[PDB]
Design a protein around this ligand. Sequence first.
Ligand SMILES: *C/C=C(C)/C=C/C=C(C)/C=C/C1=C(C)CCCC1(C)C
Ligand SMILES: *C/C=C(C)/C=C/C=C(C)/C=C/C1=C(C)CCCC1(C)C
Ligand SMILES: *C/C=C(C)/C=C/C=C(C)/C=C/C1=C(C)CCCC1(C)C
Lengths: 265, 265, 265
Amino acid sequence: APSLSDPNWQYGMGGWNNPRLPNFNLHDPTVIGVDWLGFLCLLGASLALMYKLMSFKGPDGDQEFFVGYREEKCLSIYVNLIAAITYWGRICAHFNNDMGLSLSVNYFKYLDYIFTCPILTLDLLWSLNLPYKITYSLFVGLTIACGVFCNAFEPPARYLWFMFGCFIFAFTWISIIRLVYARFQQFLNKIRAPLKLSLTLYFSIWCGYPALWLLTEFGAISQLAAHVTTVIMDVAAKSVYGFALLKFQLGVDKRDVWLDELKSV
Amino acid sequence: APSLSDPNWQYGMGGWNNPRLPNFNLHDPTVIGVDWLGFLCLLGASLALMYKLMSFKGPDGDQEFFVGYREEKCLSIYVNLIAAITYWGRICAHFNNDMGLSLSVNYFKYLDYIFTCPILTLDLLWSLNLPYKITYSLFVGLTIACGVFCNAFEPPARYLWFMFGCFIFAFTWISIIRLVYARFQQFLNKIRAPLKLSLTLYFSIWCGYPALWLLTEFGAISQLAAHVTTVIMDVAAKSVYGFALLKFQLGVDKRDVWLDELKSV
Amino acid sequence: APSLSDPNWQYGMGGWNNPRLPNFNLHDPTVIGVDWLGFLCLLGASLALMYKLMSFKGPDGDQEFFVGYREEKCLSIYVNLIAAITYWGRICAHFNNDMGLSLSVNYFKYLDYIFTCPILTLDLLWSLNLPYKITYSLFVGLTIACGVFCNAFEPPARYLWFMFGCFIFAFTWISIIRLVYARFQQFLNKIRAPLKLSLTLYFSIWCGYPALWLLTEFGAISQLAAHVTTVIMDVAAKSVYGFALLKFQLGVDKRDVWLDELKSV
Ligand SMILES: *C/C=C(C)/C=C/C=C(C)/C=C/C1=C(C)CCCC1(C)C
Ligand SMILES: *C/C=C(C)/C=C/C=C(C)/C=C/C1=C(C)CCCC1(C)C
Ligand SMILES: *C/C=C(C)/C=C/C=C(C)/C=C/C1=C(C)CCCC1(C)C
């Protein structure tokens, strides 16, 4: 009796077809332009990061492959490159008239984030030498899986999965923010306002994904606007972050007095 | 000519439909109750482990994030949490009348074990400082993949995959048991009978999965009884294990004389 | 309007059905024999590597589990074993008349390579102590994913994915070859011609995969010949490599003067 096809519901792209959202035309000029812009931004950021890292000769300017033997510094590059590949799929799907198996790369919403967000969290926590560097990465991965199930499934299980992922993300993100603030309250030793604004806005960009999902679900924001905003948030979250960290963890052993093991909060 | 739909066989939930097993009603009160109990047990165990670990301040009571900078101690928590998420899916599938895409979380038998058993084996071998700590984890993962293919496929390939996974598991488990006995014959220095009973019964719980599959396949044990027994075995294998290890590897560097590199068997 | 089924194209095994290639009879005696030979070769190589590694007692002949506590030496074994499992699936699919769900193990071309090539690259770069040991592993993985999408999708997106994977592989492989030549120009201190021939032919075997795909795509080489050549290339690339490295990185700490961190190219 159990089956994957409930005959009381409709299905389409990405799983359950919400009866209140109209069909989203993936072949609109706005969508093609925005996807091209996102792919170009991510690929350019990845190439520039790779050039700036591999070309670094070390603090004393004699160590070829200085970053090659210190792999944790390259963790940013992958986060961009994988994203670029995902966006490349979108471009391919438009050359195929947004048709057939080519859509499979981005068929399920938030699935592409499974291979990026955990690595971004891991690199952010490793760069600042913070505790629970992988535990929170796994928690973010489970959040992404919860979101994938939520967007794929029918209303009841969809909302239950959303709630599960929401508490997991809330706990992990509050913990990460407290750790990062504790670490950065030592750096302060003009920079204060810009640093605080950058930190709070970077946290807000992450917090804005579930807000966008909720706005899209109940017909507040249109699907086209949601797509454009999602592309902008992905670019802002991934491209800048690596460049911001590049001028910070270059030519260091990552065990300085500033970045020693966190003590007393 | 090749196709994924052999017209000489029937198909249903989880792949091939055995013509000798009746359809298993996933919407039975017993199944809902047992799945709720399993989810509650796994989630409670995960939360209690997380609280007891993150709250540990170190041997001298001055190291906040003592476990945060020693990640290998948290490897237990993930094993539970992932399991809980899997069980959460079951609960979601019952709120959706055991219908539609919601079943996809537990569509394929033993697939959920792919992300838990390797981590459990890795943590068990790392805690006791034993050799081949990852090789046996990968072997267990390949065993889980073999079981997934076995349950998914039609009789001939099903039995061949079962046989392959069976020898892999036999070799890996005998090796692990010999290593664990060699390590624990030093600890003995009242505890002997309880420790031996706990160790042998924990090994028996792992050994009982293929036995349950064989009993279910040939109509000895009913599918409902198999489901209840599988839930009990999962709880026993995962919830207790972490709590048992918690009072052992707390506030240590994991390189003591007892847990030095194994020598002479 | 978007759907995974473009009605202007045909579909079959592995995704898009090329209208210029005839249906490939997977139940031909040549295919069964070649798959059996490949499975036997990979499994025998894995078993012999495992026996020769686990049985090593260390440089001074007193360290049981010498390789067990030095895991990076076993990275070869997994590369073979996983491959064997994949080939096992093929054998299973022939016992099921090349029918039904059993084909799912090898439904998508190059998907099986996702879990082998990255590990092979990682082990090769780690054994010689070379930089970017994981970055190039991830690049090879993304190349394999690009190839999977290329073979799965319809002509336009297929060729675009092929081009993307082709540049990624070109960059990564030229970088790896330059690093390996730089490392091995120190070893030279009769061996020169055999070593150079082995190195260049091993690189050529890797370079020959996209060449085989291009030859198959445009009806130059027949599908049966492509299958046999692919099996031979897999055996040559995986079985020999581990045995070649076995007599090199046995009973060493992997930080000798020859294998110190690469300097000045
Ligand atoms: C580059 C892409 C990034 C950083 C994406 C991040 C995505 C999230 C943090 C998503 C979070 C979600 C929840 C907290 C609730 C469930 C829905 C999600 C997946 C959108
Ligand atoms: C928490 C869940 C756990 C520990 C599950 C463990 C499962 C196994 C050890 C399964 C083993 C199997 C075989 C040895 C043969 C093939 C069938 C399996 C997968 C049930
Ligand atoms: C044991 C199997 C091995 C080593 C397989 C290796 C495969 C490749 C290096 C494949 C490379 C490809 C490209 C560079 C272009 C796209 C097509 C591929 C995947 C065949």
